[PDB]
């Protein structure tokens, strides 16, 4: 792990995360209600916008469509082109708070999970229509993840202590997965490649637990972490995991052994947020915190 400190901020609180699979840039989403693209290269800021007077919570990069995506405290979902800065859509998604919205890789699909206890799959080449609504879930849906693997399926992570899989096209789960994290679900992650049908989850009960979503069997449970976990993650190209937590640290897990690497302290207090390079451009990874966040290159 030869970690190089690429490019940090200080801020208001980041609550969403994302890098651009192309261009040197992540966006970030802040609790003023801005949002920022960076390049994290040049250390200068690209682009930023007044989204809104709330907390921005999700957003993510449509690379192929020059958008973001991003949801905020006041139900609403925005699309802008990050060129320009035009704003494409405005539209209340959901009666409460946005926390995790998803981009299909191949179709012109954005899901977004609630805290009305749905999943929402809308449809931009439909005029960002409502088309499914996906119901069962008894809390809040924190994260919602398609399979890459197989995105006419995708997972939510929910308060209620499930991750339920779903088919696009389906009312009902394919199945539902009870975690024994009694504290609730707050992020699930898909293993990307082939060899090992996984998945994985952090709650605030202080635990990870990696997942055989066809045995449904817990392969493993990672424990360390001092406070809520917020979120957990495959590296893309690297076997290691990536998690952070309300006790500031991010900690790098061995995906083969089940065992710490390293934690880290970057000093920014709280850690909400995780990004990793979707091709692994210098192993990078991100992390938003409440005092800003930073960028690192694993190695």
Not at 14 to 42: A, Q
Request: net charge negative; with cysteine.
């Amino acid at each position: 792990l030869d970690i190089k400190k690429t490019f940090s901020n200080r801020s208001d609180r980041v609550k969403g995360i994302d890098f651009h699979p192309t261009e040197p840039w992540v966006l970030t989403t802040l609790y003023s209600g801005r949002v920022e693209i960076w390049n994290y290269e040049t250390q200068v800021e690209v682009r930023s916008i007044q989204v809104t007077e709330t907390p921005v919570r999700a957003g993510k990069f449509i690379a192929r469509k020059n958008w973001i995506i991003v949801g905020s405290d006041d139900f609403r979902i925005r699309v802008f082109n990050y060129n320009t800065g035009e704003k494409v859509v405005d539209f209340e998604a959901h009666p409460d708070y946005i926390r995790s919205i998803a981009v299909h890789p191949t179709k012109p699909y954005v899901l977004s999970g609630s805290d009305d206890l749905t999943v929402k799959l809308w449809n931009w080449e439909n005029n960002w229509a409502l088309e499914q609504t996906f119901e069962g879930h008894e809390h809040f849906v924190m994260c919602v993840a398609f399979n890459p693997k197989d995105p006419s399926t995708f997972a939510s992570g929910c308060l209620d202590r499930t991750v339920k899989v779903w088919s696009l096209g389906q009312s009902t789960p394919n199945f539902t997965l009870t975690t024994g994290q009694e504290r609730g679900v707050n992020y699930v992650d898909y293993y990307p490649l082939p060899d090992k049908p996984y998945m994985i989850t952090a709650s605030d009960d202080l635990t990870i637990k990696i997942w055989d979503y066809q045995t449904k069997s817990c392969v493993a449970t990672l424990e360390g972490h001092m406070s809520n976990v917020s979120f957990a993650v495959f590296h893309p190209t690297l076997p290691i995991i990536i998690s952070g937590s309300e006790d500031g640290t991010l900690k790098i897990w061995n995906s083969s052994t089940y065992k710490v690497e390293k934690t880290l302290n970057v000093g920014l207090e709280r850690s909400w947020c995780i990004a990793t390079h979707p091709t692994g451009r210098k192993n990078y990874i991100a992390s938003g915190f409440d005092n800003g966040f930073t960028v690192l290159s694993l190695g």
